[PDB]
Amino acid sequence: TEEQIAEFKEAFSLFDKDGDGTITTKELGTVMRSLGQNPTEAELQDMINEVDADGNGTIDFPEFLTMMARKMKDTDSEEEIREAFRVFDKDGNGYISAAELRHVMTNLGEKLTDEEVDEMIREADIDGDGQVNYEEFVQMM
Amino acid sequence: TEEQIAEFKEAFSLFDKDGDGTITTKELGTVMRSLGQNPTEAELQDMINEVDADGNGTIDFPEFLTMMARKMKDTDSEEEIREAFRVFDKDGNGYISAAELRHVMTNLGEKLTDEEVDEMIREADIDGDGQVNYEEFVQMM
Amino acid sequence: TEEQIAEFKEAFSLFDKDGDGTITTKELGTVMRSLGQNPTEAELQDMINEVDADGNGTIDFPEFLTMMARKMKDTDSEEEIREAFRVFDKDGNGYISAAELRHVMTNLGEKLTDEEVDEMIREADIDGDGQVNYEEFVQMM
Amino acid sequence: TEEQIAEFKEAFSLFDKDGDGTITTKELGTVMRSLGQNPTEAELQDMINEVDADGNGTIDFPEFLTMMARKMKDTDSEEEIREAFRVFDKDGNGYISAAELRHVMTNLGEKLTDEEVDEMIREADIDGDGQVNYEEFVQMM
Amino acid sequence: TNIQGRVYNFLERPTGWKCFVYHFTVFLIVLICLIFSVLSTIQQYNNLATETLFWMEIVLVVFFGAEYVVRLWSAGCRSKYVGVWGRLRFARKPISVIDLIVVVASVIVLCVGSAIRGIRFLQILRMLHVDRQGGTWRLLGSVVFIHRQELITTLYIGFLGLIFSSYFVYLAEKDAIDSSGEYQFGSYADALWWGVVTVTTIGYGDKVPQTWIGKTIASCFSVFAISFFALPAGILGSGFALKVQQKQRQKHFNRQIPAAASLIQTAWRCYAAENPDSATWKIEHHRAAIKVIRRMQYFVAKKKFQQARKPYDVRDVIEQYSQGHLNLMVRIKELQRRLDQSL
Amino acid sequence: TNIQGRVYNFLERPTGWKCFVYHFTVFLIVLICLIFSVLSTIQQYNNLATETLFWMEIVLVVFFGAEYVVRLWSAGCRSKYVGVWGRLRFARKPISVIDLIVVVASVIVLCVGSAIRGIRFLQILRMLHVDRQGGTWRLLGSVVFIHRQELITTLYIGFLGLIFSSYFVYLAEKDAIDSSGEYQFGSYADALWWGVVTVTTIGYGDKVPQTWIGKTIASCFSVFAISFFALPAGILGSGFALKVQQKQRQKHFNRQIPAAASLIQTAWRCYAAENPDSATWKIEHHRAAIKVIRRMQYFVAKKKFQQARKPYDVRDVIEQYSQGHLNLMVRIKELQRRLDQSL
Amino acid sequence: TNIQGRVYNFLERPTGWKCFVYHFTVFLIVLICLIFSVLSTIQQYNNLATETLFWMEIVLVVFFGAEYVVRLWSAGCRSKYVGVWGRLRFARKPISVIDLIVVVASVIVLCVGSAIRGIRFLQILRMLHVDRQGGTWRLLGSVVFIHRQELITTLYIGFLGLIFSSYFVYLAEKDAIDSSGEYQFGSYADALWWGVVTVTTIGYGDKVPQTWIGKTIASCFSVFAISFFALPAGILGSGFALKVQQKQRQKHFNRQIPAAASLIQTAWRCYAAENPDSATWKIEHHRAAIKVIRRMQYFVAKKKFQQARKPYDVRDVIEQYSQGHLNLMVRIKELQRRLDQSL
Amino acid sequence: TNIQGRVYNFLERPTGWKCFVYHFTVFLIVLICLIFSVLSTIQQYNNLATETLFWMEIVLVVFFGAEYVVRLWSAGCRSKYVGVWGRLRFARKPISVIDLIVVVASVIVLCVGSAIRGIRFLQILRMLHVDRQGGTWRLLGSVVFIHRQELITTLYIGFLGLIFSSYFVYLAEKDAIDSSGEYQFGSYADALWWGVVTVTTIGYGDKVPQTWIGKTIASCFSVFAISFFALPAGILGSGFALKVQQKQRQKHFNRQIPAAASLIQTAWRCYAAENPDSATWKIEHHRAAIKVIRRMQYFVAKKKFQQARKPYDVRDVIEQYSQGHLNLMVRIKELQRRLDQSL
Ligand SMILES: [Ca+2]
Ligand SMILES: [Ca+2]
Ligand SMILES: [Ca+2]
Ligand SMILES: [Ca+2]
Ligand SMILES: [Ca+2]
Ligand SMILES: [Ca+2]
Ligand SMILES: [Ca+2]
Ligand SMILES: [Ca+2]
Ligand SMILES: [Ca+2]
Ligand SMILES: [Ca+2]
Ligand SMILES: [Ca+2]
Ligand SMILES: [Ca+2]
Numbered sequence A, B, C, D: 001t002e003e004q005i006a007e008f009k010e011a012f013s014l015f016d017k018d019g020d021g022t023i024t025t026k027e028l029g030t031v032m033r034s035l036g037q038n039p040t041e042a043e044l045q046d047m048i049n050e051v052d053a054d055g056n057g058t059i060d061f062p063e064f065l066t067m068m069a070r071k072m073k074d075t076d077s078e079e080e081i082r083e084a085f086r087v088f089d090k091d092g093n094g095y096i097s098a099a100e101l102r103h104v105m106t107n108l109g110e111k112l113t114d115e116e117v118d119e120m121i122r123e124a125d126i127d128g129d130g131q132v133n134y135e136e137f138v139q140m141m
Numbered sequence E, F, G, H: 001t002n003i004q005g006r007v008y009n010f011l012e013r014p015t016g017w018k019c020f021v022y023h024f025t026v027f028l029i030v031l032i033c034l035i036f037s038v039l040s041t042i043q044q045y046n047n048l049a050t051e052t053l054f055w056m057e058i059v060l061v062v063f064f065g066a067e068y069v070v071r072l073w074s075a076g077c078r079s080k081y082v083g084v085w086g087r088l089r090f091a092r093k094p095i096s097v098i099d100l101i102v103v104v105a106s107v108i109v110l111c112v113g114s115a116i117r118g119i120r121f122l123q124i125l126r127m128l129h130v131d132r133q134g135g136t137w138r139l140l141g142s143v144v145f146i147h148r149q150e151l152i153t154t155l156y157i158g159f160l161g162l163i164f165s166s167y168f169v170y171l172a173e174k175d176a177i178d179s180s181g182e183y184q185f186g187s188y189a190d191a192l193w194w195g196v197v198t199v200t201t202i203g204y205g206d207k208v209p210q211t212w213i214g215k216t217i218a219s220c221f222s223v224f225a226i227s228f229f230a231l232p233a234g235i236l237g238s239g240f241a242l243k244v245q246q247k248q249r250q251k252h253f254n255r256q257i258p259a260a261a262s263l264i265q266t267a268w269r270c271y272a273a274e275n276p277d278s279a280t281w282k283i284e285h286h287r288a289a290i291k292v293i294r295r296m297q298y299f300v301a302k303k304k305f306q307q308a309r310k311p312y313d314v315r316d317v318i319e320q321y322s323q324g325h326l327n328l329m330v331r332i333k334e335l336q337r338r339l340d341q342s343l
Helices: A002-016 A025-035 A041-051 A061-069 A075-087 A098-107 A114-124 A134-140 B002-016 B025-035 B041-051 B061-069 B075-087 B098-107 B114-124 B134-140 C002-016 C025-035 C041-051 C061-069 C075-087 C098-107 C114-124 C134-140 D002-016 D025-035 D041-051 D061-069 D075-087 D098-107 D114-124 D134-140 E003-011 E017-041 E047-077 E083-092 E094-112 E118-130 E132-146 E148-172 E188-200 E212-248 E253-274 E285-309 E314-342 F003-011 F017-041 F047-077 F083-092 F094-112 F118-130 F132-146 F148-172 F188-200 F212-248 F253-274 F285-309 F314-342 G003-011 G017-041 G047-077 G083-092 G094-112 G118-130 G132-146 G148-172 G188-200 G212-248 G253-274 G285-309 G314-342 H003-011 H017-041 H047-077 H083-092 H094-112 H118-130 H132-146 H148-172 H188-200 H212-248 H253-274 H285-309 H314-342
Strands: none
Touching: A002 A025, A002 A061, A002 G285, A025 A041, A025 G285, A041 A061, A041 G285, A041 G314, A061 G285, A075 A134, A075 G253, A075 G285, A098 A114, A098 G253, A114 A134, A114 G253, B002 B025, B002 B061, B002 E285, B025 B041, B025 E285, B041 B061, B041 E285, B041 E314, B061 E285, B075 B134, B075 E253, B075 E285, B098 B114, B098 E253, B114 B134, B114 E253, C002 C025, C002 C061, C002 F285, C025 C041, C025 F285, C041 C061, C041 F285, C041 F314, C061 F285, C075 C134, C075 F253, C075 F285, C098 C114, C098 F253, C114 C134, C114 F253, D002 D025, D002 D061, D002 H285, D025 D041, D025 H285, D041 D061, D041 H285, D041 H314, D061 H285, D075 D134, D075 H253, D075 H285, D098 D114, D098 H253, D114 D134, D114 H253, E003 E017, E003 E047, E017 E047, E017 E118, E017 F188, E047 E083, E047 E094, E047 E118, E083 E094, E094 E118, E094 E132, E118 F148, E132 E148, E132 E212, E132 F148, E148 E188, E148 E212, E148 G118, E148 G132, E148 G212, E188 E212, E188 F212, E188 G017, E212 F148, E212 F212, E212 G188, E212 G212, E212 H212, E253 E285, E314 F314, E314 G314, F003 F017, F003 F047, F017 F047, F017 F118, F017 H188, F047 F083, F047 F094, F047 F118, F083 F094, F094 F118, F094 F132, F118 H148, F132 F148, F132 F212, F132 H148, F148 F188, F148 F212, F188 F212, F188 H212, F212 G212, F212 H148, F212 H212, F253 F285, F314 H314, G003 G017, G003 G047, G017 G047, G017 G118, G047 G083, G047 G094, G047 G118, G083 G094, G094 G118, G094 G132, G132 G148, G132 G212, G148 G188, G148 G212, G148 H118, G148 H132, G148 H212, G188 G212, G188 H017, G212 H188, G212 H212, G253 G285, G314 H314, H003 H017, H003 H047, H017 H047, H017 H118, H047 H083, H047 H094, H047 H118, H083 H094, H094 H118, H094 H132, H132 H148, H132 H212, H148 H188, H148 H212, H188 H212, H253 H285
């Protein structure tokens, strides 16, 4: 994992904005601004909190490493996603309307762009039918 | 129900104040101002919350339709009203003083105008006695 | 009770500061200022809340009457006072140090003036001993 | 204990900043400033609250005396410290990495200076091994 | 005059001292009657008691009839029960019906008559009279409804276990005769009965598993089954306790008032909305908008009323905080605007 | 001197080590006496024990008398019990009364005397001595009071069920003779007894339903009845647990002080109000207004005190928030005014 | 067409009126069958019932087979069960498996055949059919899992106590013969059995301690043991009650939606992140940073979703307050800055 | 090397899979041994089993000895147990002591020896080995401690009731001979025993009240007594449930860290304070003041740590709110001052 760790370190350094090696919220905000999303302070705080191992308002390098470590496509993670999907799925089946899904993506939550939604749809619905299998999609992910 | 739906759509459009077809609180406030009631922001928020199906601070057209759908004079609704009436009814009977009722209407809660109160009284007390049957009134409603 | 009611009405009228016959907090504050105590708004609110029957931020005349009605030297009331006294009484007996009592009066809670405290002491300690019988005092009250 | 009490009184007098003999938060803040730590008002409030017997936002002389009275190296106190130590101790043993300890001292909580940390380390690790016995240290304290 | 109302209060829904005393007396009388009936039932005190019963029972029935009549008369206090139809409706209520049944049956018995078979049953029934207004039963029912999901499950699984255990015991102890010279588990019915007894934890001991295997199975299938059967008692008790706790932290009754009033007002407004040339049309498109607004207000009001009715909770607190916070934010924004405006 | 007070503490309401030890010793002695009495009761150890009892019992009674006397003497510590009247009042208290009864009765027995019938009863009574200050009973009583509404209901409905079940069993098993050659349910009383046993879940098995129909009815009417009878135990336990939990999150005692003081002050002010030429008239219409204000303050104070007394709750939190929020709003308003004023 | 889905709904996971009725009917039929079996089991009604059973049982099995087939057909409604593999997976589920076992076994019995030994067992098994979707068992299981730590302990300690008590009783009553002329505690096994009975609180009374010492030991070791054995029933009940209470103060379903959506979106974003030339790369070092940010967002989203799923709690309230407060502080700071900037 | 630590983990405080399996195996072995002992106890399987026991028991004891030795060796992992004294201290712990007793006793038995009286007892004792680290008992103990006030009361009052009931039954049924020709309540001891049985709800039925008066008294004094005796089981269960619920809403472990660190730092500072020429004297009267300040800080820190340790509660929320609110107020005041200053 040496190469991976080096990469992570590099990433951290570019993020950090200082020689202290301790990520404040301010640094994160700056980074976000550089991208151009323009996030709220509360949001930033929330982001840091999840990451933070010590729970002291500052992301340590070990903390960062820990967050990197826990991988997606773990079964526990998948369950939550499935539950979420179910929440939007009428008719209590592994099936949702494609158009409806698109609409939801456009509107509810952290809004997703039209192109992105189209891409998602393409990824999901291999068949021409709009009734898309969310379970399958989740598995693929 | 096609005609009804059309009517509802028309209403929504006149309310909306924009081509987005998504009612914010601001739009509602504007509408209120146009009438001339001059409501508080909190009140507006409360109003939207009850309506909102998705629960995202914005009234969708489907949400609006849903609110229209659930009709008054349903038995569940009636019970609440009866309970409320009881709350103001001394002597644990289906009877309240007309004068007292009038006073309450004038003073407590979302104040009701004198003329309106008079009208209400007329509607309720068919007989000349002030001891008005609230249950009967509720049934009529 | 006719005379009593008349007196109460008179009192209310002098308090009211207006023809509405509905005491707001502002009126109460004004009255307080006239005396010269200079109270906090929160305090005023608290005062009104206890009084208020309807619980609508305004003291009705009936509410006022109700408050007048419930008399001191009722047994329930006495118990609370006794409990309070006990709270300050060391040695788990119906006895407290006179000096200590004086000190408490001077310092803790709604401060009591020196003269007043002296008067209180005189009222309580008939005997020359400082160990004053609080129960007896309560009974007298 | 007469001498001790005299000393305490002297200390109180120097702290007090006034002839009232009643320590407000403001006085405490002033004292802190004189030292030069520059504390937050909330912190000051917290400090007073723990001390305060009556619980009235003011430290009485008796209260002060009481706080002085309860001595460290009482068994109850020790347990808490041990628990705290355990919280930072990996491998569920009476052993922690010296370097790690130093790091924690530098970073987490009320930050401790480098020299101070060094001193602490010296006090603790009599032996040359970094795996320091925290229980022993606690006992010594 | 308020006399009818007073009478009603005395009879049904009483918090009076005198009324309470009367009720207690009635209860005592009923108990005495029951005792007498019991005494009569045993052979040693049959001849002496019958005459007494005859003397007393008729009187009691007359009294009850009178009471019933009075209650019926008093129904006019409540506007729910007015006229003949109202009275009929009142009568329809369960306790009243029961009372009627008791009285008429008693009368019939008297007519038939001094031996009586159904009189004992009537006496037993009578004890139910005292629980007026359904205040005893209703609470219990509510609690059951609240905890039905779990209770039902417990009943089911436990039942299943009992069945299985019974079957196993039958399989075990079919051939094994007792020491007294009689087959304890001849039929499956017997086994079932035994199982029921065991789960109940009565333990009569008329039947006990004779075989070692049977004993083992009993040991295995007892404990769990016992626990399951005890569950309802536990769970219900817990529920009751929780309810009591909730009651202890109820809202004040004065807080319910304004919300209720508001709700009423909104309802009235809504009603008016349909009537075109009414007084409430004061202060086409506009009208439509107003209607919608009124409906919204009504909805809000209902919610508020419901909240008022409910006890204090964390959700309520959160809501309150939100309400405060938004207001504060708005104020701050206004201030900011003012500052900007000035410059 | 503080000696009387110390004595009182030692005797009644003790948290002392020595006192505790003494109490334990007393309890042990009582237990021993009880054991001896029990032994005497059986025929095999009657002749040897009587003499011992005679020797010891008198001594014990003397000791108890002495203790009682000491307690009486010590009453002067508490200002509630001063002089002769105070002492009499103290004596009136239940435990003390019981003790008195025990001692006098014992003395009477001794005078009469070495056989004794009432001595056994006295011994039994004696065991109640140790629960001093009513700390055991009082808590229980409080809990019962808190959960009475439900408990009573459970008692009632269950009782009714029991009655009904008994009746049904009587109806079933009147004619059916047992295998031993004796009618199990000859009387309704017997049936009732059986029912009671069954609901209790003792299951002696002296009586068991013989008929199949009877058995069926028992099966039907058992389970529910059993649950009902178990309810009190459950519910009370739950209540106790809840109480314990509440206690665990109590307020600190220092927070009660200031409120209490305030209350006291307000009471004093109110008292003064009646006296026209008093010192509290410092700082006609005006006087009247002041009186009203004082009363209001008193009312507030009482409420505050009550709140302090109670444990932490969501309602309290909400109140706190409201208090904060209003203050903040006021401050903001003031700021706004200042800004406006400047411009 | 939606017919398959409808069929599925009717069969499994039904909230329909008609469906409910059907289920009830089925249950009733099963009960009747069980009753018939029981009747057959006793010797007096064996010859008359067998023929009836033969007539009916086959029909019942056919019906059940048909139902099973229909259920299998309907599996295509759910996308979890599609094709042959999906159907197989569905079949694998426990209830379905049980049903299959019942049907095949019944068929086998019929083939063998009008006496039948296993048919009784099959009947017993059948009663489990009605608890569809595992809604009964699952809840119970969950509760057990929640309260396992304590429950297990109770089981253990109680068991230990029982063992010890049994041993002590064996030691006591080895030599002591009963009044009937038979050794009650000949073996340790017997003693163990007795202990089990006693702890259960069945109290058959086939075995009772004869020696005084034995009796004493029973008295000592009973009460505590009894309490321990009752614990599971109590604790589980309490847990159930608590769960019910929690359910009563659940969040609204509309609040879950947006969070869920957000989570989904974040997941999608994360997925995109791996694909270099995708549409989601809109709005090397920079890319890396973006990836990290997306991951962070996802983590946040998951947490939010979890919170939404959970019921209302003090922690949630605190979080909300914090969120509000920080925002307010920021606003204030901004205002201050503006003021400073102007001057 | 970390091998010793690993060994310790495997033996005591294991969360390992392999370790768990090993433990299970051990438990199974113990159970088997117990079963064998039981079998030996009954006369029919004595001659065949003894030899087997001899063969196996010695081996088992050797194994246990080895295990003990290993555990002792592993104590060096924990710094609490270092050297010889540390090891001795470790041994002193209860479970270890028990194990030692078992092994030595077994050895003694072997030496004496293939009959053995104490071996059975040793086997029984052995079952306690599996509950390592006291995780089973400790929790229970804690719960008992928490609910002692009420539990004790229940034990007391119930006991008293039992006594009284027994006495009354003795008074009732002294003269009354049974149908079998033997006095059921000859001694008061017998009566007491009966009472105990009844309250327990075992209901052996060896003794039953014969007189009608006696029966009546039993009926009266049963129900309440039964409820009281059931209370402990209920209450404890409720407590357990509550504890579980509390656990469910625990704080995150990361929140405890900083507070703990702070506490540690404050302690260190305090320690330094005594040493005059130390490094911590950086940044006479002044010194004194500093000491006081440090002590205050320490006190604060301790409180904070305690709060962190505890679960979430309304009090905590209130505190948080207060903290926020004060800060906000201060900020507002500062702003106001600035505004004033400018003008
Ligand atoms: Ca940095
Ligand atoms: Ca960190
Ligand atoms: Ca598709
Ligand atoms: Ca719009
Ligand atoms: Ca919406
Ligand atoms: Ca009328
Ligand atoms: Ca006015
Ligand atoms: Ca009012
Ligand atoms: Ca005096
Ligand atoms: Ca000062
Ligand atoms: Ca103070
Ligand atoms: Ca070292």
